[PDB]
Amino acid sequence: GPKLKGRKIVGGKAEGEVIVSRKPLSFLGGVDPETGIVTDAESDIRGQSIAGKILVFPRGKGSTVGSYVIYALKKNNKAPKAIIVGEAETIVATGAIISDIPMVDGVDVSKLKTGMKVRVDADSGEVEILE
Amino acid sequence: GPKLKGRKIVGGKAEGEVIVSRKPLSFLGGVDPETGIVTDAESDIRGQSIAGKILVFPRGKGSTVGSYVIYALKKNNKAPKAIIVGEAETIVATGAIISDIPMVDGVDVSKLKTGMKVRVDADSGEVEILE
Amino acid sequence: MYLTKEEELILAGEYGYALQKAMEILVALGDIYGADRLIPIKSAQVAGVSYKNIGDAGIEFLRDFVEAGAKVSVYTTLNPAGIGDDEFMEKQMEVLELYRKMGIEVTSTCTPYYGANLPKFGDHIAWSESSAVSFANSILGARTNREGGPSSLAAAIVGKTPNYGLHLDENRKATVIVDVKAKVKTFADYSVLGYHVGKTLGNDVPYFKNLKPEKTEFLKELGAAMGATGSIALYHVEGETPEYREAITDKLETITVEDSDLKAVRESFQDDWSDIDMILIGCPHASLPEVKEIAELLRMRGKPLKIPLFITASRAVKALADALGYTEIIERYNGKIIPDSCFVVSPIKGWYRGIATNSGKSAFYFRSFGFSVRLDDVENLIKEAP
Amino acid sequence: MYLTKEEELILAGEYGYALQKAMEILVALGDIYGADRLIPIKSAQVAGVSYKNIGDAGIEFLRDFVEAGAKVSVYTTLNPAGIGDDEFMEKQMEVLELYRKMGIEVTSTCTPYYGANLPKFGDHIAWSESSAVSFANSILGARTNREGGPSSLAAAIVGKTPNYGLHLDENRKATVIVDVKAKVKTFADYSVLGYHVGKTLGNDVPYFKNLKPEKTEFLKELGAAMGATGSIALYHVEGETPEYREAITDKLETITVEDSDLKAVRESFQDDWSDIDMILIGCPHASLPEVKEIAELLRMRGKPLKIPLFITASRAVKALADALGYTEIIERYNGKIIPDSCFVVSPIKGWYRGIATNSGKSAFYFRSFGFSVRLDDVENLIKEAP
Ligand SMILES: C[C@@](O)(CCOP(=O)(O)O)CC(=O)O
Ligand SMILES: C[C@@](O)(CCOP(=O)(O)O)CC(=O)O
Ligand code: F3S
Ligand code: F3S
């Protein structure tokens, strides 16, 4: 299918179902590390699980401790299989790095919609939509 | 005699004998408030009394507490009758103000020498050398 | 990213696992963002301290360093701890002891620049804690990225950080102008201004016009709020921040903030007093002027509060408050200064249902946690409280 | 100088003697220097505290204010007290109580910017203490004249200062360039650089080239020394101080500082260890990094000093040192942190004959008082002391 080319944040390869938010996300406050369930009372995907999915959001916001929430999610095996963002700041990148979660940024995330199947080639920064 | 025109710092009028230093002066450390004797070990007029004289020096240096030494000199009746400086900074001006010691600056102090008799018209900023 | 021969040996493990683990984080980051090299840092500030925030997984991550004998190689200060029951505090002491063992100054405050660790204009540093990042970049003109907790720790251990982002002149230029038409005069005015601007902008460096804060703490709060609802790490204020005069080098768009923008935030944080059972001031940690203000307001009220007032503040400010007599005054009226700690990062759900505060950052986080919230200036809170 | 209607009434005595006495000092100054108006100040710092410096005449001056119910109308901090025998300390307590009665924060430190009173870039303030004037103007880019003790007090009471001098953009421009060819790397290097430059320049605003201090405390000491041997209230350092990029607007002369200039100062402060009976660090008052450095040097020495080491520091720094465990370490080796006090302004002639120090400001004043002086970096003093 169509390919979206971006930037490698953390390498690896993954394929799965996409869950998309259009609002900036802070993992500290926005995601429960015990469950993988979004807990932001104003998230457009509040109540849904990110565990084992391909998480799409535009950019991070909020706490510099977000990196530790990502790490705790991974240790509880409730982290997404990969993360696709429009722009990944240091906090989010750092969480992916210490958690070994494949991650890309620089992708036109408006072209991704919830429920799509996608391949993320994080080593090359490429996202492929599967038809 | 010749007139040197400068700037009023503190008003008043005085006439007396001049004692000249060519080095910047800090009253805190440079003058003993009990005696009026210069105590700077590197002053060119060390050991001499300023009490009741017309003191000439180029500019202040050193402590912002110099204003309080000037005040203590005045209260011990060991202060000069007037002070002539090349440039008077806030610390020195403040000491003269609270001590009511006539003072001018902006004078070409190189034209004054120890032992001269002078009239200081501090209200107008004028120094007159008496021949 | 270029590495020196010594840095290559560190990466290779020649100097032990602790330095290699830290270096691997820094190399990954520098490679992502196109940093040319590692640069030395004059200090670090490390967040990720409250056991509520980092959990057992965070303890494991730190113990991995500590068991390899990790030690910071530059001056490093530390963010605040949480407060909780016996089991929580045992875990919380474990975390602080792990940081202590790495040679970090256990200062436990988000305002290290009040006496413990004051960056100089132009200094390159590696700080997490988003409000302190904002303070150091914007108010002091030092240079730090918005570090993650772990990347600030990695930098502290290596003593260097990758040279990208806010370390570079070109990334300190304004990206947008913010014209503040709204009336903004009080602390709580700046709280809601920052709340609004943080969520209205993206990854931006805003230049504020028509903003003349009477008190530095107003800008401390502005940066804290924008770093909570948004991702702002550096901003400029015309006439008021040290880098403002060369901040605009391009033609930029202007957004304007109106009274209606600020009213909307204020009106959403107005839960009834009957739902509030504590007042919290000091997010970020209170300055000594902030403590003084509260002592004066409590003496004018002239009767104790019937709900507790808590002032979170640094050890330095707490000690000055003790020495100058403000602590005794405040305790006379059911107020307390709590050093070393932060209530936002504490598991206080079952202890307090509602928090009144003047902090936009606290109001944002407590709301998102399900608490009732009343946001107002501290003079109004102290006058109106039960 | 223009006065508002309210300021005219204050001058006239309509609001009592205390405000009128302060206003008369400020009006005289503004009239001398051509100030257009009085401007509000965000804070004051008041020197003239040690009884040795101000005497009974100083007590009378302050009591004149206090007996009229004088109170500062802006946030005001206070310089350090002296130390002496019973009669001296009774007088010293009298002075501090007079300042306390005027609503001043009795902080008793020349480094209020370590947690008590931190000026922001661009802030107009009225500070005495020449090293703090230098710090606020040069390192933070705030704006204050080199106030006399009494003019800072007068400004604190009125809450305003005359708009002349360093409050004006044109008087913050460099007047001369200082090219530092000499090797200047350590604290004591900066002590003697400032000693030399202060007495070589006149009423100047120097712009330093080829000067890259590793630590802010190096510039703290540079400004302290130049404000002691000279009258420097503001300086610029290329790349290192917030106002440097628009400091040069004219063609200026350049003086150069060579190794020979610094050797001369060093060699004049080298009295024999047999004439030294105390080590003094913390002029201006020590930062927490300075305290940390000494704890580390004492543990490496590994045996106590046989002459006392004193570290003068702010209450804030003392409390951080207590809390972080440095105080206990230092006391193990015959060192002590002395808060709230300054030895240079103390009548210690009959208690100590010779002082070893790393401070150029202390070395200058103790020499001029007749003490023996050894000036050196604190690592060398701690290693070599008996
Ligand atoms: C939300 C935040 O204030 C949490 C701090 O937690 P901790 O005290 O560093 O454990 C950090 C930040 O805003 O960057
Ligand atoms: C010399 C000096 O440090 C003396 C301070 O005395 P006091 O602690 O303010 O009483 C003041 C200054 O340098 O301006
Ligand atoms: S860390 Fe400090 S900035 Fe606020 S959320 Fe806690 S008081
Ligand atoms: S007041 Fe402070 S600057 Fe030195 S002379 Fe005393 S320690």
Residue numbers in the entry:
A (entry chain B), B (entry chain B): 0 to 130
C (entry chain A), D (entry chain A): 1 to 386
Sentences from the paper on this structure:
Aconitase superfamily members catalyze the homologous isomerization of specific substrates by sequential dehydration and hydration and contain a [4Fe-4S] cluster. However, monomeric and heterodimeric types of function unknown aconitase X (AcnX) have recently been characterized as a cis-3-hydroxy-L-proline dehydratase (AcnXType-I) and mevalonate 5-phosphate dehydratase (AcnXType-II), respectively. We herein elucidated the crystal structures of AcnXType-I from Agrobacterium tumefaciens (AtAcnX) and AcnXType-II from Thermococcus kodakarensis (TkAcnX) without a ligand and in complex with substrates. AtAcnX and TkAcnX contained the [2Fe-2S] and [3Fe-4S] clusters, respectively, conforming to UV and EPR spectroscopy analyses.
To clarify substrate binding, we directly co-crystallized the wild-type enzyme of TkAcnX (inactive form) with MVA5P, and the crystal structure was elucidated at a resolution of 1.9 Å. The [3Fe-4S] cluster was located at the same position as the structure of the apo-form, and additional electron density around the [3Fe-4S] was clearly modeled as MVA5P. In the structure of the holo-form, TkAcnXS and TkAcnXL showed no large conformational changes from those in the apo-form (chains D and C); r.m.s.d. values on Cα atoms were 0.5 and 0.6 Å, respectively. On the other hand, the two subunits were closely rotated by an angle of ~26°; substrate binding resulted in a more “closed” conformation than the structure in the apo-form. The carboxyl group of bound MVA5P made hydrogen bond(s) and/or salt bridge(s) with the side chains of Thr63(S), Ser130(L), and Lys361(L), the main chain nitrogen atoms of Thr63(S) and Ser130(L), and a water molecule. The water molecule further interacted with the side chain of Tyr365(L). The hydroxyl group of MVA5P on C3 formed hydrogen bonds with the side chains of Glu129(L) and Lys361(L), among which the former interacted with the side chains of Asn79(L) and Ser131(L). The 5-phosphate group made hydrogen bonds with the main chain nitrogen atoms of Gly48(L), Val49(L), and Ser50(L), and the side chains of Asn53(L) and Asn79(L). In addition, Ser62(S) was close to C2 of MVA5P (a distance of 3.2 Å) and superimposed onto Ser70 in AtAcnX. Therefore, the catalytic mechanism of TkAcnX may be similar to that of AtAcnX, except for the involvement of the [4Fe-4S] cluster as a Lewis acid instead of the [2Fe-2S] cluster.
